[PDB]
From TrEMBL:
Top-level taxon of the source organism: Bacteria
Keywords, in A-Z order: Lipoprotein
Record-given protein name: Lipoprotein
Organism: Microbispora sp. ATCC PTA-5024
Length: 92
């Protein structure tokens, strides 16, 4: 369903490390997240680039979010799950 706020900016949600409430999972600056029809989740960077957030969105033809991945300390990539789950809770 729509985002549980008034005037929901057309169900699009601008998102940052502070707003998500979890460690920022990509190397790019703050952007927008969106649900699209048939349980797809998308992320759009601040330069306008639309990427896939879940595997379905990547099967759909939205691009990998892989080149802009963030490592943790002593290396190793971070998960997009807390950010994904929160994005599909929003459009619950």
């Amino acid at each position: 369903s729509p985002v549980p706020l008034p005037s929901p900016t057309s169900n699009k949600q601008d998102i940052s490390e502070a707003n998500l409430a979890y460690l920022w999972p990509l190397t790019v600056d703050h952007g927008t997240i969106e649900c699209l029809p048939s349980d797809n989740a998308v992320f759009v960077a601040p330069d306008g680039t639309t990427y896939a957030l879940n595997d379905r969105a990547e099967k759909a033809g939205h691009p990998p979010i892989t080149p802009i991945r963030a490592k943790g300390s002593g290396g190793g990539y971070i998960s997009l799950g807390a950010l994904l789950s929160t994005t599909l809770n929003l459009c619950g």
